[PDB]
Amino acid sequence: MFNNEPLEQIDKELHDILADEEKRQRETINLIASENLTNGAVRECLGNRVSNKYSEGYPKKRYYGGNDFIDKIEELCQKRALEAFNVSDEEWGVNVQPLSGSAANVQALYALVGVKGKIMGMHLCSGGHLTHGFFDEKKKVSITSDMFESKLYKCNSQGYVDLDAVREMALSFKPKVIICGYTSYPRDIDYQQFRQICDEVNAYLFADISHISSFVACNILNNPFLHADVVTTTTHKILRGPRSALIFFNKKRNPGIEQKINSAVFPSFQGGPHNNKIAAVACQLKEVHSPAFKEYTQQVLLNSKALAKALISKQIDLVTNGTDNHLIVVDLRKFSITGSKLQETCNAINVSLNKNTIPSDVDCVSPSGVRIGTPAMTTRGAKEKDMEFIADVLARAIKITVDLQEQYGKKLVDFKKGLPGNAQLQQLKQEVVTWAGALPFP
Amino acid sequence: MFNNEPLEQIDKELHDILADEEKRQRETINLIASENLTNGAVRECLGNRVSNKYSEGYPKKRYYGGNDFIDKIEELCQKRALEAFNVSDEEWGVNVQPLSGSAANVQALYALVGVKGKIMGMHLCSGGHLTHGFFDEKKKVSITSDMFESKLYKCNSQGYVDLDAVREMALSFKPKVIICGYTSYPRDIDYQQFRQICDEVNAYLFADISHISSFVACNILNNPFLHADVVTTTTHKILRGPRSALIFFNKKRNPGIEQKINSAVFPSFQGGPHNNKIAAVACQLKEVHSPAFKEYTQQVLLNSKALAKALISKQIDLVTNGTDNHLIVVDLRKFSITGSKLQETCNAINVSLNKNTIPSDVDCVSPSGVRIGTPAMTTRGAKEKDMEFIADVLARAIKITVDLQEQYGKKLVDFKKGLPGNAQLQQLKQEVVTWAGALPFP
Numbered sequence: 001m002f003n004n005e006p007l008e009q010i011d012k013e014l015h016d017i018l019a020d021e022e023k024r025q026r027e028t029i030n031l032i033a034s035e036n037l038t039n040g041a042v043r044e045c046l047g048n049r050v051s052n053k054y055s056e057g058y059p060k061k062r063y064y065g066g067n068d069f070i071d072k073i074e075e076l077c078q079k080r081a082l083e084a085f086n087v088s089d090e091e092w093g094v095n096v097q098p099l100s101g102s103a104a105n106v107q108a109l110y111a112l113v114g115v116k117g118k119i120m121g122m123h124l125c126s127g128g129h130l131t132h133g134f135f136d137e138k139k140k141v142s143i144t145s146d147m148f149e150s151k152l153y154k155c156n157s158q159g160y161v162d163l164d165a166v167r168e169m170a171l172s173f174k175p176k177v178i179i180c181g182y183t184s185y186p187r188d189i190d191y192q193q194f195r196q197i198c199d200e201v202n203a204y205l206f207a208d209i210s211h212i213s214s215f216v217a218c219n220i221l222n223n224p225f226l227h228a229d230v231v232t233t234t235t236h237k238i239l240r241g242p243r244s245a246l247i248f249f250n251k252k253r254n255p256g257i258e259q260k261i262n263s264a265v266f267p268s269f270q271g272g273p274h275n276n277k278i279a280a281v282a283c284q285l286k287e288v289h290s291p292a293f294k295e296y297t298q299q300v301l302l303n304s305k306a307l308a309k310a311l312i313s314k315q316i317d318l319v320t321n322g323t324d325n326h327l328i329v330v331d332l333r334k335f336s337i338t339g340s341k342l343q344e345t346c347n348a349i350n351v352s353l354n355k356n357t358i359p360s361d362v363d364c365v366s367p368s369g370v371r372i373g374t375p376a377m378t379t380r381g382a383k384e385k386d387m388e389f390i391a392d393v394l395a396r397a398i399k400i401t402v403d404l405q406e407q408y409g410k411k412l413v414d415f416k417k418g419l420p421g422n423a424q425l426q427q428l429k430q431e432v433v434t435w436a437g438a439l440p441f442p
Numbered sequence: 443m444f445n446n447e448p449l450e451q452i453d454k455e456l457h458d459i460l461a462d463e464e465k466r467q468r469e470t471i472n473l474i475a476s477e478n479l480t481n482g483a484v485r486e487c488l489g490n491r492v493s494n495k496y497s498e499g500y501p502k503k504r505y506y507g508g509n510d511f512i513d514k515i516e517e518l519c520q521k522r523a524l525e526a527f528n529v530s531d532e533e534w535g536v537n538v539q540p541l542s543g544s545a546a547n548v549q550a551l552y553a554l555v556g557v558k559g560k561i562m563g564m565h566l567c568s569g570g571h572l573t574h575g576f577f578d579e580k581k582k583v584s585i586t587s588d589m590f591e592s593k594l595y596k597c598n599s600q601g602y603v604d605l606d607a608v609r610e611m612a613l614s615f616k617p618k619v620i621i622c623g624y625t626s627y628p629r630d631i632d633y634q635q636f637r638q639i640c641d642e643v644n645a646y647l648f649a650d651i652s653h654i655s656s657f658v659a660c661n662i663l664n665n666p667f668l669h670a671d672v673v674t675t676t677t678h679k680i681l682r683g684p685r686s687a688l689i690f691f692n693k694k695r696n697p698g699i700e701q702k703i704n705s706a707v708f709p710s711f712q713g714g715p716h717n718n719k720i721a722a723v724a725c726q727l728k729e730v731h732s733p734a735f736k737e738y739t740q741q742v743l744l745n746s747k748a749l750a751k752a753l754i755s756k757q758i759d760l761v762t763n764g765t766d767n768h769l770i771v772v773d774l775r776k777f778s779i780t781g782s783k784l785q786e787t788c789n790a791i792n793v794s795l796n797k798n799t800i801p802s803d804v805d806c807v808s809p810s811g812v813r814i815g816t817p818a819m820t821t822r823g824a825k826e827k828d829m830e831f832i833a834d835v836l837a838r839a840i841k842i843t844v845d846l847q848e849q850y851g852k853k854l855v856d857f858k859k860g861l862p863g864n865a866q867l868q869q870l871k872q873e874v875v876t877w878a879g880a881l882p883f884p
């Protein structure tokens with residue numbers, strides 16, 4: 001007693017928009033540092049009937065029976081995760097149930113410190129995530145600042161994490177957890193120094209590596225598994241999996257931590273797991289542990305270095321003057337245009353990027369930067385040579401943005417009016433669409 | 443620079459288990475009250491490239507651009523939802539971002555009351571959910587009992603919600619929210635009476651209708667939208683959607699609730715939405731609002747009544763002696779077997795059900811019932827005639843369970859030893875597999 005007609009016959013209205021969405025993705029230069037494109041096999045898992053099953057609990061500790069095949073998939077996923085991140089299952093545990101990055105960080109934080117617990121994290125404005133304790137004078141913006149007591153550490157004026165400030169804060173604040181790994185940080189992290197600071201105050205070390213996870217797995221960047229008690233990551237960014245999260249815990253360092261984490265994910269926060277997510281994650285973790293994926297990750301870094309170097313050749317300033325990873329943050333102060341203005345301009349030319357704060361910024365309204373990344377475009381086959389064109393397109397959009405601002409003024413409402421119909425933008429979009437439309441698309 | 447091989451070529455190990463899972467689903471008599479089977483169209487959405495997109499924020503208020511088509515899908519979803527639940531978009535608002543039911547409840551609860559906030563809900567043992575404030579002497583099991591202050595109200599000895607007790611509790615406890623709508627409750631709810639109690643104490647009315655959402659939408663059962671401040675529901679159960687949740691808020695009763703609820707989902711708890719989820723939900727919400735789906739829902743109730751009646755003709759006791767909905771809870775005390783033993787017996791015969799508490803039960807360990815539901819089997823085309831056979835199968839499983847307990851003893855370890863190779867079970871399973879295997883499968 002069901003309708004088995006395909007999506008196109010069943011809901012033509014919805015199917016058009018999805019096909020529209022498909023066309024926009026394939027015709028866009030996607031520089032969102034956190035975005036990627038999943039392969040058909042990962043999308044087959046996400047559409048699988050495994051999502052039908054309710055399997056509250058953990059493998060071999062299910063509330064319900066009929067979970068034999070589900071248990072194999074959840075165990076296959078945990079093995080592949082520990083393998084991919086070069087950790088021993090005797091020494092490290094992992095939870096595959098968190099639905100997304102934010103849920104996983106909140107669940108993990110709760111496990112470690114509990115309600116009213118004290119946490120330290122990097123500020124959103126300096127490159128931290130919302131789930132790292134972010135609040136504002138006006139509001140406790142994140143649950144992580146409301147169900148926990150949070151202190152926030154700023155990066156220095158050159159955009160690097162300033163450890164002296166971190167230690168100064170840890171000794172005075174005395175938190176139970178200190179979080180590192182960030183949302184818009186273009187450089188590598190000194191985990192060892194974090195581990196040294198955490199010990200002095202007897203606090204846990206929490207590394208959130210969602211943005212750089214692939215780098216850590218393939219040993220191109222510093223390894224937080226050597227020093228951290230907990231490691232969290234999403235699977236949908238540089239890792240190129242579905243939208244999900246992973247929580248790693250150091251049993252050797254903290255016995256009895258497995259129970260706290262596992263009980264935090266369920267039943268403290270979540271109910272039934274999403275089995276299609278888990279199947280999809282397993283599928284990508286196998287790809288992650290192949291010499292080919294290491295190649296791709298290497299390619300992402302090469303493209304990022306080349307992109308940075310080309311932007312600098314065109315007189316564009318980058319925060320910290322470059323990158324050790326997949327992402328770059330452009331300081332736009334010399335051009336006197338805001339990041340929101342450039343983002344608007346870039347949408348008009350089918351270039352996806354995001355406005356981003358810089359060290360000088362005092363407000364999340366009017367940020368002075370944009371953040372770009374290479375993983376999506378690297379997934380689409382762009383090589384080092386292709387980055388000069390991306391940099392050229394961005395330089396042209398900056399100039400166009402300056403021209404329009406000269407013509408209509410700094411008020412964002414007035415600036416947007418200049419955008420529709422602009423000859424140069426229509427031309428620029430056209431070149432963007434023609435090059436973007438050509439590239440391999442999973 | 444990606445691998446486009448199909449799932450079978452790319453991951454044969456994973457692909458076999460999924461086909462295994464598929465075959466077990468198709469060969470099982472699925473009586474899990476919270477389970478259903480999604481159509482190909484809903485799974486096409488789940489596998490869609492829309493999940494590649496990051497769209498933090500809300501429609502027309504996105505952090506990033508390139509969200510034109512994503513915005514159409516989110517607005518189309520909220521529109522379709524409000525229509526389905528027969529509410530005016532002027533009077534009610536809905537949030538479509540929550541990843542699952544538990545997340546949605548925690549988010550909604552936080553919006554209304556905040557940290558340390560006072561809430562009241564039905565106890566887990568009486569048919570309430572974990573997200574309704576569940577705690578135990580040994581620990582605060584749900585975040586809802588830890589981040590909030592919760593009081594729990596029990597049903598009476600006949601299995602009915604006892605309003606006198608709720609009022610007694612509300613006036614004494616003075617919570618900001620009172621929750622109704624349950625995980626294992628076989629009868630309808632008097633929302634009006636709840637609305638009265640809440641007014642007496644100035645508390646919000648929260649209805650969780652995930653198990654009965656279809657009955658509320660198609661108007662076979664009482665409408666909580668008439669009385670509640672908030673309605674929450676999952677989309678993966680009777681509604682037949684993907685795994686996701688919806689949060690409804692009454693704007694007329696509480697202006698400025700829209701912002702409180704919306705900010706709670708993001709950026710308080712979650713980050714990026716899962717667009718494939720939202721797309722999937724829109725697709726099912728269209729089906730919900732068709733006269734055909736009302737027929738299916740009607741059929742779920744016909745099947746449930748018939749099943750209760752057939753169980754009773756076989757001398758099996760039901761909590762509240764019947765049902766007003768899709769679910770039944772069987773009291774097993776007269777047979778001196780526990781729910782866990784019957785669940786084990788039922789997995790051996792490919793009958794999916796879950797152990798459940800009954801009013802007499804003091805502790806969650808060793809519960810004296812099993813909960814069954816008709817939505818999955820109704821989805822597979824089972825009519826009222828087919829229920830006598832299901833009831834017959836369950837009667838045989840109870841008898842066999844009693845015989846095995848006689849042979850091997852009441853200890854769970856000892857009882858399970860009798861299970862493998864049992865001639866009657868092999869026979870019952872084969873009978874089960876033959877009938878189940880034949881039914882339509884989406």
Ligand SMILES: Cc1[nH]nc2c1[C@](c1cc(-c3ccccc3F)cc(C(F)(F)F)c1)(C(C)C)C(C#N)=C(N)O2
Pocket residue numbers: 123124125126127128129130141183184354355356357363364365367498505709713
């Ligand atoms: C959307 C998002 N999610 N997690 C994040 C952001 C960022 C961000 C967040 C916010 C923000 C502020 C208050 C409340 C909610 C918010 F999302 C404002 C801005 C800004 F300034 F550019 F408008 C940027 C950015 C990557 C998009 C951000 C940055 N920078 C950081 N570090 O982490």
Ligand SMILES: Cc1[nH]nc2c1[C@](c1cc(-c3ccccc3F)cc(C(F)(F)F)c1)(C(C)C)C(C#N)=C(N)O2
Pocket residue numbers: 056063267565566567568569570571572583625626796797798799806807808809
């Ligand atoms: C798994 C689940 N999720 N939400 C639920 C349950 C139930 C349940 C929950 C628990 C439970 C207890 C402590 C901690 C975590 C738990 F999941 C124990 C039992 C039981 F009785 F079978 F042991 C049953 C049931 C539908 C499966 C339950 C019931 N009854 C209720 N009302 O809501």
Ligand SMILES: Cc1ncc(COP(=O)(O)O)c(CNCC(=O)O)c1O
Pocket residue numbers: 033034100101102103105129131181182183184208209210211234243244496712713714
């Ligand atoms: C370090 C980090 N942690 C957690 C999250 C949360 O992931 P979910 O959105 O799946 O909840 C993000 C997302 N960062 C947003 C971006 O970089 O674009 C992140 O950058």
Ligand SMILES: Cc1ncc(COP(=O)(O)O)c(CNCC(=O)O)c1O
Pocket residue numbers: 054270271272475476477542543544545571573623624625626650651652653676685686
């Ligand atoms: C009333 C109610 N609310 C929330 C949930 C949880 O939704 P998620 O599992 O998607 O978090 C359930 C599922 N209860 C388990 C069952 O009935 O089988 C429920 O019955």
Ligand SMILES: [Cl-]
Pocket residue numbers: 046274276277488716718719
């Ligand atoms: Cl999903």
